[PDB]
Every structure is written in C-alpha cells, then in structure tokens.
C-alpha cells in the first residue's frame, strides 16, 4: 500500500556483471554506481544537476553483499538456482514513418540469472552503431528485466531482429519488428 515506492536494489554474482548497485523511483532507475569507473551515473541530466550520491556508499554495499553471498553459498551447500528463460518484445519508441528517425526497443523480461548476450541484427548482419542498453533491472519477483535500444531510420528494405542468449534458452530467442 503506497503512493510511491523508492528502492535501493543491489545484486552480486559469480558471472559478469559481477555486481550492480542502483536506485529506482516507481520501477524506473534514477541512478546507479558504475562499479568499473567507480562513479555515480544519473539517468537524466536534470537528476545530476539537482542531486548527488557518494559512490563509496554503493561500493561499500557491494562489499557487504559479496560477503553475504559467500556465507550463503556455504549455508545453502552450493545451491545454484534453475535458469529461468527470458520473454522478449520488440517495439518502437515512436509511431513508424518511413524515412523519419526512431528508436527500436528490445525488452527482455522475467529472466534469472542476470547473465545475458543481446545482439541487434539487420538483414542477418550484426549492428554495432546506434546501440544503447539499460541495467539488469530487478523485478519484485526476484527475476530481472532489461532494455536494449537501436536508433534507426525506418526503411521498407531493412528488417531488424533482437537476438537474446540466456542459459535457460537452448536456442537463442530471435524477435522482430519492421
């Protein structure tokens, strides 16, 4: 029962990404501590100009969580969870107009562990530019979701696919939208 839900969510695992520390307001990530550059990254420019978060607070929490991980690996007698495959959806940000710029969104949902490989393909060809991605967003059911983005110019000759590899999938999941 709430008007708003503000949550600090952090995870730590054996595979890459080894850890993650983030803050969400109503299921939307406001900021995260980039563990590699060791600095706070704000989702929108406006959040950074108005607020501050000291990176050491995230780094310290990751350290605590890693200690808790090792203790639970011992306690659970090395219990590895089942691989829960993702559910993929491709949709544009804007209504499609041939020739007019747009963003294709690949939303990978209900998966565990947060270990994944995502590639954008156009006509069976690997696409490296105009690509962006969200973090591994923690769901309230202890599963994860993620967003992948591709900035493109709608062409009737160009066929886009989002390919996702996950341990719970024997075959990679290949999803599309024009």
By a kind-dependent CB cut-off of 5 to 8 A, residue 117 interacts, out of ligand NAG, other proteins, none, with ligand NAG
**Closest Cα to residue 58, out of 11, 107, 90, 92?**
11
Please name the residues in contact with 10: beta carbons below 8 A apart, sequence gap of 6 or more: 19, 20, 21, 22, 58, 61, 62, 65
Nearer to other proteins, 46 or 157 (CB): 46
Q: What is the DSSP string of 150-161?
A: EEE---TT--EE
Residue 104: name the closest of 149, 65, 163 by CA: 149
Q: Which of residues 86-115 bind other proteins (CB under 8 A)?
A: 91, 93-95, 105, 107, 112-115
Run of H or E residues at 67:
helix 56-75
Site membership for other proteins, residue 131 (CB under 8 A): no
- Choose, by CB under 8 A, the member of 36, 37, 46, 171 that binds other proteins: 46
Q: Is the Cβ of residue 62 or residue 108 nearer to ligand NAG in the bound state? A: 108
Give strand pairing partners of 148.
106, 133
Closest contact distance (angstroms) between CB of 131 and other proteins is 14
Residue 43 contacts other proteins per CB under 8 A: yes
Smaller CB distance to other proteins: residue 14 or 155?
14
d(CA 120, CA 59): 32
Considering the complex, what minimum distance in angstroms separates the CB of residue 8 from ligand NAG?
26
Which residue, 61 or 143, is less far from ligand NAG as judged by CB?
143
Contacts with ligand NAG by CB under 6 A lie at: 75-77, 115, 117, 165-167
């Amino acid at each position: 029962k709430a008007d708003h839900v503000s949550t600090y969510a952090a995870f730590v695992q054996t595979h890459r990404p080894t850890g993650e520390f983030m803050f969400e307001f109503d299921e939307d990530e406001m900021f995260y501590v980039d563990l590699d550059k060791k600095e706070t990254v704000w989702h929108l420019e406006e959040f950074g100009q108005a607020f501050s978060f000291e990176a050491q607070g995230g780094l310290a929490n990751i350290a605590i969580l890693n200690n808790n991980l090792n203790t639970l690996i011992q306690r659970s007698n090395h219990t590895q969870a089942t691989n829960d495959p993702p559910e993929v959806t491709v949709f544009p940000k804007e209504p499609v107009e041939l020739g007019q710029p747009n963003t294709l969104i690949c939303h990978i949902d209900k998966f565990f562990p947060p270990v994944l490989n995502v590639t954008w393909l156009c006509n069976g060809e690997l696409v490296t530019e105009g690509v962006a991605e969200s973090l591994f967003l923690p769901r309230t059911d202890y599963s994860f979701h993620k967003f992948h983005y591709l900035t493109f110019v709608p062409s009737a000759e160009d066929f886009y696919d989002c390919r996702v590899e996950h341990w719970g999938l024997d075959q990679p999941l290949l999803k599309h939208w024009e």
